[PDB]
Amino acid sequence: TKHEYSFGVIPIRFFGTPDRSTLKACFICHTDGKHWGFPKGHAEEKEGPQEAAERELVEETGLGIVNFFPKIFVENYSFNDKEEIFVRKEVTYFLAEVKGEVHADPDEICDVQWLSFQEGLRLLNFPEIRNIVTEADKFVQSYLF
Ligand SMILES: Nc1ncnc2c1ncn2[C@@H]1O[C@H](COP(=O)(O)O)[C@@H](O)[C@H]1O
Ligand SMILES: [Cl-]
Ligand SMILES: [Mg+2]
Ligand SMILES: [Mg+2]
């Protein structure tokens, strides 16, 4: 009965003059499982969470950080792994305006879509990640709009 810890980024960008209608986020499809979400991964030894999140984003999508926003999001879920071990997993997401063209690492990302938070919600089935996007949509509205 293991505990797993992961760190990721919700990557956002404005396709035009910044506003509610022009914010999009980089939704990705996970090669291992084909569920949708955001880039994330494990911290290397002694790495801080934000450092691990930045490195995992660059490794998986080639995107670079413009600015972090002063906000994090946390989810907790449980599953059984390939070898049938019960896992309790905690994922911490940072939120960042990003730059670059996406170049997915196909070993981890098998599809990419830039969508509004509400559009991307349609791709999400697990309740915990739906809560994440609901909170993130609530945040960008109060913080920016
Ligand atoms: N919210 C969730 N609830 C239950 N299982 C999940 C959830 N998210 C991902 N999984 C599963 O956990 C495994 C690892 O997914 P991930 O942590 O997203 O790499 C895969 O088998 C996923 O289908
Ligand atoms: Cl992970
Ligand atoms: Mg990953
Ligand atoms: Mg990774």
Ligand SMILES: [Mg+2]
């Ligand atoms: Mg990794």
